[PDB]
Design a protein around this nucleic acid. Structure first.
Ligand SMILES: [Zn+2]
Ligand SMILES: [Zn+2]
Ligand SMILES: [Zn+2]
Ligand SMILES: [Zn+2]
Lengths: 73, 74
DNA sequence: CGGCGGAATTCCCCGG
DNA sequence: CCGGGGAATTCCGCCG
């Protein structure tokens, strides 16, 4: 019944404050500590789902932050 | 000098599969044309393809390859 | 020779 | 951790 609030894939639980799948959990972790600067090839509104989440780390990371994901939480 | 890749605008290494392109776009088209051919765009299918952003959308990059006229028979 | 196709190699993101 | 797979550079075979 329950889905990841970022990519809509089935969630593994509440990670960093937000209900997410394992891949988004690990992605957000790597993004914050990598101090990554991502660039969208689109309009920064990109569709993020199970398949398309690979395409735009920028919009995926943005969705993580907007969903409320945080390292200390 | 110089000449630019007609796909991503990076410097072109020569004429590959009929079109002036960089090395990276050469091997990309090779992989894509023999691949699963299912690529999906997360955008509006207008995604900007340049040296920085060409990794982001295989679908749009492949489309630009085709539009530029790239083919295996060349 | 130089140009092109292409395989091989290296690098890195992704996800189980 | 690990393996899978794409990206891009490197290296080689062929031919005009
Ligand atoms: Zn997710
Ligand atoms: Zn995007
Ligand atoms: Zn190119
Ligand atoms: Zn696109």
């Amino acid at each position: 019944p329950k889905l990841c609030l970022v990519c809509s894939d089935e969630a593994s639980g509440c990670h960093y404050g937000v209900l997410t799948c394992g891949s988004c959990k690990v992605f957000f972790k790597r993004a914050v500590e990598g101090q990554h600067n991502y660039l969208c090839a689109g309009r920064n509104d990109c569709i993020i789902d199970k398949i398309r989440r690979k395409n735009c780390p920028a919009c995926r990371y943005r969705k993580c932050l907007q969903a409320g994901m945080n390292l200390e939480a």
